[PDB]
Amino acid sequence: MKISIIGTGRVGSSTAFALINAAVADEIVLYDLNKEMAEGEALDLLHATTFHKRMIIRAGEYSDIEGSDIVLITAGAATRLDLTIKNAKIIKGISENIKKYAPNTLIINITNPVDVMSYVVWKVTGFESNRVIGTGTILDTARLRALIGKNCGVSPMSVHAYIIGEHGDSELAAWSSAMIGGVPIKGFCDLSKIFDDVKNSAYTIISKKGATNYGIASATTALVESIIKNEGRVYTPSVLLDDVYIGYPAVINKDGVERTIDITLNDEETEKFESSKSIIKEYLESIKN
Amino acid sequence: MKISIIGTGRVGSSTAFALINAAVADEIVLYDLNKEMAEGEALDLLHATTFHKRMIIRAGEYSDIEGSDIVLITAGAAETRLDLTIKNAKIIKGISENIKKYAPNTLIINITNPVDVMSYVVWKVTGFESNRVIGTGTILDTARLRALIGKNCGVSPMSVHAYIIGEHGDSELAAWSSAMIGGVPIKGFCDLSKIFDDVKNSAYTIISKKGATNYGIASATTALVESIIKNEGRVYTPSVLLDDVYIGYPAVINKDGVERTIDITLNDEETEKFESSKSIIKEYLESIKNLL
Amino acid sequence: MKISIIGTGRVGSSTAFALINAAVADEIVLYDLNKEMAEGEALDLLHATTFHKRMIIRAGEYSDIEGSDIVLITAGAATRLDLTIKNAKIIKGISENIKKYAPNTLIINITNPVDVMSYVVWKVTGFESNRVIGTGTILDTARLRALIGKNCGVSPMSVHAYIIGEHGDSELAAWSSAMIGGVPIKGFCDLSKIFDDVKNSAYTIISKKGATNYGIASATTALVESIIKNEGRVYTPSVLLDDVYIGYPAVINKDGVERTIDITLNDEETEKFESSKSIIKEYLESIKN
Amino acid sequence: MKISIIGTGRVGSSTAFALINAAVADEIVLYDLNKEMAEGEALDLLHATTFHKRMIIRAGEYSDIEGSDIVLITAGAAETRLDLTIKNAKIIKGISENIKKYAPNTLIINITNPVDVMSYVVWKVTGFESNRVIGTGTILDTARLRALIGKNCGVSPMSVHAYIIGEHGDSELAAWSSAMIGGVPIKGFCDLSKIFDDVKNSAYTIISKKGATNYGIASATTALVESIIKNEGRVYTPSVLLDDVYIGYPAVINKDGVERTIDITLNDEETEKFESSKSIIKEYLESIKNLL
Ligand SMILES: NC(=O)c1ccc[n+]([C@@H]2O[C@H](COP(=O)([O-])OP(=O)(O)OC[C@H]3O[C@@H](n4cnc5c(N)ncnc54)[C@H](O)[C@@H]3O)[C@@H](O)[C@H]2O)c1
Numbered sequence A, C: 001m002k003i004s005i006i007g008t009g010r011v012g013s014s015t016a017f018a019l020i021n022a023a024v025a026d027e028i029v030l031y032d033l034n035k036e037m038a039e040g041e042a043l044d045l046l047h048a049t050t051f052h053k054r055m056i057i058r059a060g061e062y063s064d065i066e067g068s069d070i071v072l073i074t075a076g077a078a079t080r081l082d083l084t085i086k087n088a089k090i091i092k093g094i095s096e097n098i099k100k101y102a103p104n105t106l107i108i109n110i111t112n113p114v115d116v117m118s119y120v121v122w123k124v125t126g127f128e129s130n131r132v133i134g135t136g137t138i139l140d141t142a143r144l145r146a147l148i149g150k151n152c153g154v155s156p157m158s159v160h161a162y163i164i165g166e167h168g169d170s171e172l173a174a175w176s177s178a179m180i181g182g183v184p185i186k187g188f189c190d191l192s193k194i195f196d197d198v199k200n201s202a203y204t205i206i207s208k209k210g211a212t213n214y215g216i217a218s219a220t221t222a223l224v225e226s227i228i229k230n231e232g233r234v235y236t237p238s239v240l241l242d243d244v245y246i247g248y249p250a251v252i253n254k255d256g257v258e259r260t261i262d263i264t265l266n267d268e269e270t271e272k273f274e275s276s277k278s279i280i281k282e283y284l285e286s287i288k289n
Numbered sequence B, D: 001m002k003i004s005i006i007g008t009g010r011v012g013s014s015t016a017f018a019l020i021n022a023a024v025a026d027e028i029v030l031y032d033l034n035k036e037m038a039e040g041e042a043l044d045l046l047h048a049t050t051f052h053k054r055m056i057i058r059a060g061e062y063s064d065i066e067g068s069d070i071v072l073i074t075a076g077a078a079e080t081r082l083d084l085t086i087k088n089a090k091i092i093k094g095i096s097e098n099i100k101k102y103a104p105n106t107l108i109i110n111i112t113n114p115v116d117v118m119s120y121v122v123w124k125v126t127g128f129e130s131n132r133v134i135g136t137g138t139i140l141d142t143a144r145l146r147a148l149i150g151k152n153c154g155v156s157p158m159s160v161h162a163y164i165i166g167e168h169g170d171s172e173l174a175a176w177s178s179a180m181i182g183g184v185p186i187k188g189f190c191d192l193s194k195i196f197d198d199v200k201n202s203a204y205t206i207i208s209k210k211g212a213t214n215y216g217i218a219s220a221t222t223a224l225v226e227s228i229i230k231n232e233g234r235v236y237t238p239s240v241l242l243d244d245v246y247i248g249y250p251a252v253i254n255k256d257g258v259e260r261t262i263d264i265t266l267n268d269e270e271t272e273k274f275e276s277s278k279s280i281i282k283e284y285l286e287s288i289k290n291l292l
């Protein structure tokens, strides 16, 4: 099991640390524009493997990602349109190299805006869409389930609620079909306040410590684990749906997206989702050139 | 964390081995009418802890179950069903009177068959609160149904939300009308009836081939115990009090035992079958009432 | 990772259960003379996998052990010479089938007397000795370390003491070179009583519950884990030493016995070890024919 | 199980993440002079617990470390060594006075550099028993040496019994004369000196390349904490009191902290080097005595 990580900054290094702690890969290759920083991270992370699984951890060039089972893209530049433009250029260059050196790999994109950049990866690489996913709303869906579980006295495993759409303050909860232990959620255990807290927490973290990285590192490691272990767990990654990438329920196994799950939405949820899609489609048009 | 096991036969010793392998308890006390067998099992199981967790494993008398956090009842023999119900109810009555005396604050998990009827006997004889007395019910069969459905439909069993309920055994039923996969009705996601029949009948096949069954229930019991010890609030289908009988039914399990039941909707067919199960159990209870 | 188990009695089924609980193999094939009993065990054990790792668990014929990475021999008949004669016939037949259907596998023998039967396996299969081991004194060495650790207030990981020789009441502790955290054991923390208790405990278990199986199942699973994970852990299996199989320190990795460790013994330990060897060599002469 | 972390910088937050991933604590309290940064780290780390263990993670003031089972000190800046010793001793004195006041019964693990000197300052200022104050010493370097030796000689690191001791850094030494593999002197089992030099110098290389080091010490600290929480009695080389200085040295670690040291024999060369290390530490202590 070989995993390469493109962009060894705060998110890339934290995710490598979590993958080491999960003991699921044999080799991690770290790539960065800053060659010294990647070499320093690789050596520090190698030291951490001492307490877990024997692994190869090394900095490399793009040729060193050849044969990777999975490639994580965690690169990014130091207005929202300004960020999308800057990162689209970065992701295009990364994607041309993955296509060249790892034509058969599976790509998970984290770079923001995650849904837009995931589509860029898919288009530039030419891969099948099932082999290109973004982390979408995976973290927020998991957090919403944990908080509902806590508030209603039940394991999050029994809380079946999805957050879908464009990752960020315009994502939406699919309340109408949410359930706990197979009964409607409203008839089991206000819930809107919890979703609001989840949706906005990322802005608060960035506001206070400058960036966010431990949450996404853990969500990404969970997703990677279901690929490596061929679990078929249902996530809400960024996935191809109707000519855009958007957060949406999907079964993930060793081949990537096995299928999407077409959940039912009421009128208001349908409207928010189509509005989420429209916003994504316009950012894509902007970076078309 | 102290667990006592009453009846150190095939199931009792297999469950002790699984709990050791799970590394969730500090002390296991083993009880049996056959004193030397319990001592031999305890020594052998102590050897196994070498590779897992430092623990106390010992055979003991009822005074040694004092202060147990959990007591498992795996006693009795595995003949008509009424004859078995009568014989095991007498065994379970005596065990229950001793747990009442020596571990009045504990939580009891009953495995002895027929598991729903015997769980009710435990509850009545100990005088415990019903949340502190449960049987293993349909937990194994529900878990197997979700695994097989997930295999057949290409999804994790964590995403298959289907329950087997009712009287453990040939009378149990799958709550198909409310089953779902990933928050979509099961029909529209993916044959189900054949998978259920395979699950429901497998215990008979195992028993006919190797004489008894023990590894499946040992693993299911260990999972239930982990949810109590870890205060997880996971949903199981144990034997739980539902109005005026113990029966397999969805329930939230945490450190205090049964937190609540989950009232699922059943269609007309399923309601008829569940009521048939409840009737069978209640008539067994009425038949052994004079023994309680 | 495919493991086959020959003899699905108390030890065979307990070991399969422990291997399932350890989640290290993808497939276990169970063989027994009693075909119904093997099928019943396989189905019960399959049910246990539900709570652990997805696995194939099945009863099979000898052709079904083809391709096994590891084969465990846990078969045996229902005086000591009488048992050795009875089990030697059993092990010869099993070994001829392993040679035929799994020529490239690694064999771990548990059938008693474990040191004698391990040699029979080696000779009949024609395998390289590094690919044939018995469980030797692994359990008793582990127990001695746990009890010393408990009595002296230290982790068993830091207790370096070996039990060697013929498994049973004539095995011996290599006290003169034992140590705790790299100082002589006598100068760290009577120890003879602990060893005596360890050596004799198996007779007591058999005496009280008719047989023993959970201890050896756990020791065998530990040994299998160091092979599968290529750990290079030091055990005291039955290994080829000077034209006999005998319990002795050895490094175990994915290829089996990587090497033995030639520890130093004082005069009395040397005498006991050579006496242990002589006893084994005479049982081998007896079943030569 | 409650752990407080004083100094939520690169090392403090990385160690919190590793402790979360290890699932050994129920509550982590994070303290920092930079209040908003600590709050942001706590929120981000709370998100990570979603995938591991239900926990409380929160930023707090010193009153919030009351009742902590363990307090980790990861504060200070990473200039001469004497200037750093002076500046960090003042930081550590203030932290130690606050832990003394709000968590007088706790166990302290110091990471702040220079780790041996600072650990002694913690011990002196808190007035704690020495078994309850330890530094991370040479724990990481010892673990790395055993891993690399095992790789080179084809054996598990569990079978390599070698210690790095002395002052953490360029002054530390390997106790080669008593090192062993599988109960045989290391020379006769399997170049060692080059492996040690690689270990001893790697921190400098990491720091020059990525500016700081944090993942290795976070993992080593988490292993040490697990041995305390699990009452394991594993042997480490933390910074521990050895007569009248704190220095890296073999020690048995259990739920009470340092159970005992292990007096290994050193040859003449190693004794000279260890005495040189002790001298360096003691003269730093004498130099900052007026600050204590
Ligand atoms: N939910 C999410 O999807 C999520 C969460 C958090 C962060 N992010 C995003 O992840 C990305 C990284 O965040 P971070 O905190 O680690 O930033 P960072 O600045 O710490 O690290 C970014 C790394 O990318 C490197 N890099 C820049 N251009 C590159 C290029 N062409 N090729 C290769 N490497 C390049 C940089 O040298 C740097 O090391 C950002 O886009 C961030 O918005 C996404």
Ligand SMILES: NC(=O)c1ccc[n+]([C@@H]2O[C@H](COP(=O)([O-])OP(=O)(O)OC[C@H]3O[C@@H](n4cnc5c(N)ncnc54)[C@H](O)[C@@H]3O)[C@@H](O)[C@H]2O)c1
Pocket: B006, B007, B008, B009, B010, B011, B012, B031, B032, B033, B034, B074, B075, B076, B077, B078, B091, B094, B095, B111, B112, B113, B115, B136, B137, B168, B212, B213, B214, B217
């Ligand atoms: N799904 C389930 O609930 C399930 C599954 C498997 C087995 N079982 C049942 O578990 C029970 C035990 O099965 P087993 O295979 O281990 O049988 P077993 O005969 O191997 O062991 C039963 C033990 O109970 C002991 N015992 C008998 N009377 C006792 C008494 N008054 N007090 C204390 N101990 C007593 C016996 O000495 C014996 O050791 C049976 O009733 C079996 O039907 C239930």
Ligand SMILES: NC(=O)c1ccc[n+]([C@@H]2O[C@H](COP(=O)([O-])OP(=O)(O)OC[C@H]3O[C@@H](n4cnc5c(N)ncnc54)[C@H](O)[C@@H]3O)[C@@H](O)[C@H]2O)c1
Pocket: C006, C007, C008, C009, C010, C011, C012, C031, C032, C033, C034, C074, C075, C076, C077, C078, C087, C090, C093, C094, C109, C110, C111, C112, C114, C135, C136, C167, C211, C212, C213, C216
């Ligand atoms: N430390 C050790 O090495 C250790 C420990 C415990 C037991 N043992 C030994 O393990 C062996 C099994 O012990 P057990 O308690 O499981 O006995 P058991 O009677 O419960 O099981 C033995 C199995 O072997 C089967 N069998 C018999 N002949 C066979 C043949 N030619 N081919 C295939 N299968 C055959 C039998 O049908 C039976 O199922 C015994 O020899 C025992 O002495 C060794």
Ligand SMILES: NC(=O)c1ccc[n+]([C@@H]2O[C@H](COP(=O)([O-])OP(=O)(O)OC[C@H]3O[C@@H](n4cnc5c(N)ncnc54)[C@H](O)[C@@H]3O)[C@@H](O)[C@H]2O)c1
Pocket: D006, D007, D008, D009, D010, D011, D012, D031, D032, D033, D034, D074, D075, D076, D077, D078, D091, D094, D095, D111, D112, D113, D115, D136, D137, D168, D212, D213, D214, D217
């Ligand atoms: N092997 C080791 O022992 C080892 C390894 C690595 C780092 N370190 C040392 O750990 C310490 C922290 O390293 P870092 O990379 O995390 O530095 P950092 O600058 O990233 O974080 C240090 C934190 O300490 C805070 N702080 C400063 N003064 C404080 C005070 N009086 N009270 C409370 N908090 C205070 C700061 O606000 C900052 O957040 C350094 O001394 C470093 O040398 C030791």
